[PDB]
């Protein structure tokens, strides 16, 4: 019984990984949000990719702009909702991976490079 | 031969690196003020921190380009599988020609030696079939991208 | 061993009757499909390394706590013996899809792996983690066309998926 | 409005029959499938506004060009008569989903479109990046359901191929 | 060598009993088969030259330090890309070899037995074949049954490299 | 577990005989040499963070396309770059085990037996290895026979890779 | 498991007899009543993410006491495990809505509880004030219909009565 | 188009008779032949530009004289016009090797090819000094197999033999 969006995912992963590239780890779930924390630690589909390890030396120096030109918004103005009483928080810390989405992503979108 | 030459532009070009990406890839922003507006591309910090990780691998062929004096390290991968690497992530792939022409300005001018606010020491002599060189290969980069 | 022609000929013989009009017009059908088997035969051979690797791949990604020192998989012995057995299950279960029958499946790998798993203290629940995983890249990769004639395979499908779950619940 | 009931409804008049086995027959059709429509009529009108404020960026990310001086996103009156017009479409493919047909689309928000945005001078093909937004960042099993997924994103590029 | 003669012989001298219709419908399947695999060998063939110097600048673009870094094992001289077309020619010959037989047994006796003692010891990496038997199976420009028999053997060269 | 003294045990038990003066040489000869083996494995230990992470960057410097090209197999992400050192720092805790048990008994244990099915599956280079354990051999600092205790044990494990 | 048909079975094999009239009956009670707790079953499998996490920081909103030195909320870890932990009671309510009966909670929940959380010292009051925080959080229109509210409080206070 | 279907099906109706075994007959060489017209018909189909550019300056080595005044390949508009014929040739040489008769070579190149090179002045010794070029620049083991040279030869020639 399956599906014909599950099977075009699954099938990049046949491939070999010096052919498949990004494809190489398609074969990997959504679990809980439980299981990305501390005793358990598992690795979304993001930290495979070279867009978690994105750090260059050049940086926007955001003062060349003219006054209006830059914005800024929040994710929320509520502080127990930004941080409640525990420490589960989806925006302050170390526990913003712990989320029932984004295990999984779309490296189905370009290419086998 | 002369690779002292060879070597005087490669090594001005790698010390203001990162002056020239954070120089082009914000008058690319400059210029429409909207890609770092809400639901603009570089406007989040990751999309941020992957723009200018893009103009510095992009700068690094050329320059390692220059070094050998063949456009052969130019393909790579990189040459192809840029253009269908932006429109499948959905990229303002024009505007990325933009911060790749403003590039190509810089290097002729810290080649040339007539960088408005940087002078350095040099011999006498020319350079200006070395300008010619390198304005070859970042056009070969942003011909690939389109 | 036995295959699926031979699984009916011992039924028949412990009766002592010839095979019905009925039972040859069944045998008739299993060599109709015939190229179609050895489609899915020849699909899951082929890329037989990078299923067993890629799905040990995307294991170590969601159970990381495996390749940990003090886990089943931390050593070059005891990570080496693990794609082993990946791939000494994939072998049987594309030796039961050729013969239509599971009989060389548990007589040849499945019976006993359960004692032996329980003396060596391997993770029964993530063995059969890792049998699902090379499950759903063998029926995605089945149901592909990529040079082979356009047709109804979803009955044989079902077949190669219930050998998957056949050995998945002689472990766990 | 162009519904299941109102078809059948209108035919059997136009012939000056009585309900026929016909068309109890199709309407037996409006209970089968009624429960996945109801399922994105709701998703929908419990999450329009986070809907409709992140697809209108998606309209001005694309044509940058329109918050030039003299088009239609120049003052900041001009850019919230969009996003309220994004927002007047998805009520309207939430009707959608609550009639069973595509009757309010055509009747509120198609049936003279194509004179109004001409004269006003606004694209449509900003009105269809938009609305091409939100099809193609459904996410089949987190959002809805598979069958909700499939009539919520049937009922959309209706309006883009009306409006396009 | 593995051929399906050769096997369905072995099968029976073990025994030591003769051929019966067991063997014979064995060596029937390989006639059956050898019409689309002898139409491949033929084309793989006349393609040769064309799909050696392809493939050989298919390495050179997936992995272009290959030509750039000095050392014996690189192809960044005129000896060391003669070296590795040599080996493009070398994995494209058993190919051809394996479709007459029928079986793969040609490239176990001579390309796949001691090949890992090899790339350890003159340091060649397995990856730069598999990005050459990929373009050789999408570059062929064979279909049917024809590309069938075919690709079955150029992915089994891909098995024994990883 | 292969060390000098349970290599005299096991020649003694394979004879069925008890421990003569050519085992209890063997023995003899280990305690002379434990002096300069457990002083260098105190001074590798004290400086693991030190040669652990500039050796991981020695790689990226002279093969520099392992922290561009995508993959699982390189060092391109936050996990394949934390899964990198986490495998220099196998070998160097190997090494330190090695000194202190004083024969090449852990690191055939624990580490090479099984090594070269793991590259060939995982893709990853041997010669990637061996250019970060010429970095340790090269940085540690040591001198006299306490230097050429630890070297003795890091070509070692090169030798096992190339 | 304790459900319908695992008791009537179990009744009718210690008394050594086949499948009566009356153990038919008894399912047929399995078959008026799945419409009411199937309802329930698939509502909170769409949105448990959102149920656990809003009851989550309802044991900690009551006792902020927890986060003390020595305590059982301290650090990021046992939040981690706290949070589990109440995942893992909503898993099996919606485990016990499928089956009908109180089986997984018995077997998997509620067996050897008291015997961990007080060897552990996990306060067995706040494996509480989540529970009853969720089953009067629950409106009998909006969420659900009303036998299907009937069924899934009346699973979420067998949990209280067990822990209590 | 003539060809082996067609010539015995025209033939069997002018009698008025149902397909014969010799009608049948003659297909079947059809059958034994195609193996070896269609690996010279894709063999030509890719390498085309390298063979109309090698042919195309044949002849104008030959007939030097072309490119004075008042003549026919006195500039590149005409040089142009030049180069696409014997493109156009090659092309239902390509054509003929997939039919396996000589049928688009006749209605579309051939048939009234004297009536219009008489009239626009164009030398037909240069026409075929192109396809003669062709012929004899062809190595039968390495540009393609024996029997796909000839043919590829056969067609090549009743070309010349029809502008000879
Ligand atoms: C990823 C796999 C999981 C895992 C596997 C694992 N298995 C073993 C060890 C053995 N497995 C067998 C089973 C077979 N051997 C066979 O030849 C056949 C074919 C008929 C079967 C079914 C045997 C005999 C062993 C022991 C001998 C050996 O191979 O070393 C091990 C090693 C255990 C150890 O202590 O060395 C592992 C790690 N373990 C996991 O963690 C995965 C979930
Ligand atoms: C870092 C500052 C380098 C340096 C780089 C150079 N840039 C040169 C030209 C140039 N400057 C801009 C400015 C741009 N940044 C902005 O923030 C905005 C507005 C928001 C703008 C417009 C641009 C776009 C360009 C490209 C050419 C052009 O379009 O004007 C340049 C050449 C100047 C010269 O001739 O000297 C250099 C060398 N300059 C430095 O000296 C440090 C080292
Ligand atoms: C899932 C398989 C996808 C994916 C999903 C994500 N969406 C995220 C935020 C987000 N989602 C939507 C659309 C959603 N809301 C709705 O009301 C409806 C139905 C009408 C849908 C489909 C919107 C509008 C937003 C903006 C903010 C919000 O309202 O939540 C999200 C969080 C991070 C992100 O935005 O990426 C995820 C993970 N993303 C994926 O990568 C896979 C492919
Ligand atoms: C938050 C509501 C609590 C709190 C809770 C903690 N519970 C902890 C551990 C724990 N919970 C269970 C029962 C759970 N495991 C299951 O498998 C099932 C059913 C399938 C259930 C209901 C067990 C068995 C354990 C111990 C094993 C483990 O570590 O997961 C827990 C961890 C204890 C510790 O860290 O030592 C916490 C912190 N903490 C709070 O502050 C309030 C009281
Ligand atoms: C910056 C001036 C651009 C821009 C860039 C973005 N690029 C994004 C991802 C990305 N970029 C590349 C190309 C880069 N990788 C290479 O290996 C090479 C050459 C060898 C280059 C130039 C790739 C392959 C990727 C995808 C891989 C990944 O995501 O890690 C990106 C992130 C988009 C997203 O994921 O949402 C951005 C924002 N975007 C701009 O607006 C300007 C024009
Ligand atoms: C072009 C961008 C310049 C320019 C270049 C010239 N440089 C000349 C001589 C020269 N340059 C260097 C530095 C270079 N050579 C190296 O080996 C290294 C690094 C190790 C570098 C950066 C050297 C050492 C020399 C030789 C003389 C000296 O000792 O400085 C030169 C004269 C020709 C020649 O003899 O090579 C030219 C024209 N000069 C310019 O006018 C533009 C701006
Ligand atoms: C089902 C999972 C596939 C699919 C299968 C079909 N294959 C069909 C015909 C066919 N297959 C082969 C290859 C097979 N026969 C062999 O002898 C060997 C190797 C020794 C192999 C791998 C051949 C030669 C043929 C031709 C026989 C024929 O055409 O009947 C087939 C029949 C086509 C039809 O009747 O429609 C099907 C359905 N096709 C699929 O789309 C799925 C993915
Ligand atoms: C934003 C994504 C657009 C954009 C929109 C503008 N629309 C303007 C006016 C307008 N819009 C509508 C259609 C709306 N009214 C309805 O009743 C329904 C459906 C029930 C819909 C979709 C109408 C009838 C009008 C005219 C009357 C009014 O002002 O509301 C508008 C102002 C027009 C002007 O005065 O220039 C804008 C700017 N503009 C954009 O840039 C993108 C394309
Ligand atoms: C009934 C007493 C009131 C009423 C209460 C409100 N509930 C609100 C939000 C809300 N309620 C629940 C619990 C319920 N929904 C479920 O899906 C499940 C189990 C699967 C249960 C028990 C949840 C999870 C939420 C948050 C999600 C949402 O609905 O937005 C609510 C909005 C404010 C709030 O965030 O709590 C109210 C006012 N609503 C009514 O109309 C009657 C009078
Ligand atoms: C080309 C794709 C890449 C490459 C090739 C390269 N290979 C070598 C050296 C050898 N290759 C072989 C392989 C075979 N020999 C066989 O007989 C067979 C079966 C028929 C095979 C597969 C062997 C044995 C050697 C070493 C001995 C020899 O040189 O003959 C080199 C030279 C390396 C060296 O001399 O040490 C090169 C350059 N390398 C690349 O960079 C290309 C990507
Ligand atoms: C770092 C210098 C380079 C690199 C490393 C890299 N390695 C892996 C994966 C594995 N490494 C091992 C090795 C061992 N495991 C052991 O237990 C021991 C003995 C104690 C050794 C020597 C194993 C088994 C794996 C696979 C397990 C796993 O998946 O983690 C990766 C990840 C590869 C993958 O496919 O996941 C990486 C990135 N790669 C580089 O690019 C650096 C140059
Ligand atoms: C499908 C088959 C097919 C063809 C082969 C061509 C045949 C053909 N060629 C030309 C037309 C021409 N043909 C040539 C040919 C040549 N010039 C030379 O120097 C050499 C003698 C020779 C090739 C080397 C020139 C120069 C013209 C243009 C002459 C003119 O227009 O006056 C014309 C007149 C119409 C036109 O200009 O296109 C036609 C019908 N057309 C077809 O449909
Ligand atoms: C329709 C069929 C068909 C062909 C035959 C070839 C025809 C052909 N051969 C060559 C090219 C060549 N052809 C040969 C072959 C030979 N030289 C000799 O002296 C011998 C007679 C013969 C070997 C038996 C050689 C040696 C070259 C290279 C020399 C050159 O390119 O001028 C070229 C130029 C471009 C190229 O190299 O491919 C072309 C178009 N292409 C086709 O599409």
Redesign the interface.
Known sequence: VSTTKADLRYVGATKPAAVGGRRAMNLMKQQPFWMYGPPYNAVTQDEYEPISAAAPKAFVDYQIFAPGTVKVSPDSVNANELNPVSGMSKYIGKTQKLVGDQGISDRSDKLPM | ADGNKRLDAVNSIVSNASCMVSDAVSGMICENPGLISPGGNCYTNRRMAACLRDGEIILRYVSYALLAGDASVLEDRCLNGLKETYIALGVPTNSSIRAVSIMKAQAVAFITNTATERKMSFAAGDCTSLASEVASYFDRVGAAIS | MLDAFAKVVAQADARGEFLSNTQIDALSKMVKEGNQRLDIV?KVT??????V???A??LF?????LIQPGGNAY???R???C?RDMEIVLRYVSYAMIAGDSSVLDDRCLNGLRETYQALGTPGSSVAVAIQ?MK??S???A??TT?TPIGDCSSLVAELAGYFDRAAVSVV | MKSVITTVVSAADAAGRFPSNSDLESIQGNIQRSAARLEAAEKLAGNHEAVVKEAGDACFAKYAYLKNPGEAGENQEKINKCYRDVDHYMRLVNYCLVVGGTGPLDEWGIAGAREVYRTLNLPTSAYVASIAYTRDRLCVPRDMSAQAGVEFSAYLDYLINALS | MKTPITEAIATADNQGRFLSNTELQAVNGRYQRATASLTAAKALTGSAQRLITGAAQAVYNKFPYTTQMPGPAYASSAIGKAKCARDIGYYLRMVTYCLVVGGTGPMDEYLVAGLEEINRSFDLSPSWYIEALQYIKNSHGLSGQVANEANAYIDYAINTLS
């Open positions: 020849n082929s890329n037989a390394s990078a299923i690797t890629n799905s791949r995307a990604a969601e159970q990381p706590q050593t070059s012995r990570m080496a013996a794609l995983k759903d890249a029926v995605a990769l149901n592909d040079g």
